[PDB]
Design a protein around this ligand. Structure first.
Ligand SMILES: Nc1ncnc2c1ncn2[C@@H]1O[C@H](COP(=O)(O)OP(=O)(O)O)[C@@H](O)[C@H]1O
Ligand SMILES: Nc1ncnc2c1ncn2[C@@H]1O[C@H](COP(=O)(O)O)[C@@H](O)[C@H]1O
Lengths: 98, 90, 105
């Protein structure tokens, strides 16, 4: 019944860069992630209407957000996409923090 | 990298109304959006054709956007969820 | 002009074969609606789930998005607990705002 805080990233980028983003999550110690495929978009939160986009959802301890955004920075300065950081609550924070 | 507050809308509606919804985001000054397609769902009318439009906007654009979506959602199925999020800028 | 009200939003990620178990818990608790994102992929503690590799589309990971009043969170999580102790998946609880509490409560 008790809930514990965590952060949740939504990383939206072109499907061709999936391996780069998942490798970056794995190296930072992220314990898991979910990928929503076949997304489409327009502009900037630029995306072309024909781009095959994905959204990577990653629940992470707050201590990993800074290093992850620092890792995604050179990528997002040269490629389309974004990272949305959410506050979430989970019942079992051990599943998400090493 | 500094974190900045934003609002993130999740607008869930029938795919047949996509153009109406994206035109309204365009006309309000929303700079970009992402669409999650081919959704299923349960609502007050029955089961499901549905899409989810994700837009991260400054808080000042929330009110005008909801005011724009109001006649639509008073006559059509669909929901809007407003989230508080943070985004990092260099 | 449009008043906003607080609500909670669950994201429930689980194997598609368990969709009915999850939607039945939501229906029973009085959840008024839900949205399902299908054919997902993901990395779990014991391996990868790749939706596009499944022979039956219904077996792929799904994410059930459910906006619920805060009072339904505890009973729902209590229901999901034995399931997630024996099956793959996660539940993320978010704070959101909505314009029409009656549509959800
Ligand atoms: N940290 C996380 N962030 C986002 N999604 C996650 C996370 N951890 C798990 N998931 C999702 O839950 C699914 C199942 O994870 P898990 O329960 O650890 O599975 P298993 O142990 O059987 O491999 C993952 O494939 C992923 O879709
Ligand atoms: N409580 C809810 N949580 C998540 N999605 C919802 C909820 N209520 C409605 N929806 C979505 O909105 C669609 C239309 O519902 P409605 O406006 O009640 O006809 C549903 O089929 C779902 O996809």
């Amino acid at each position: 019944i008790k809930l514990y805080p965590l952060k949740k990233l939504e990383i939206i980028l072109e499907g061709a860069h999936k391996e780069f983003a998942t490798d970056l999550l794995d190296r930072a110690g992220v314990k898991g992630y979910t990928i929503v495929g076949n997304l489409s978009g327009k502009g900037s939160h630029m995306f072309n209407e024909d781009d095959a986009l994905i959204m990577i959802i990653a629940a992470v301890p707050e201590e990993l957000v800074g290093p992850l955004l620092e890792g995604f920075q050179p990528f997002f300065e040269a490629h389309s996409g974004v990272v949305f950081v959410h506050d979430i609550q989970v019942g079992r924070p051990i599943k998400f923090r090493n």
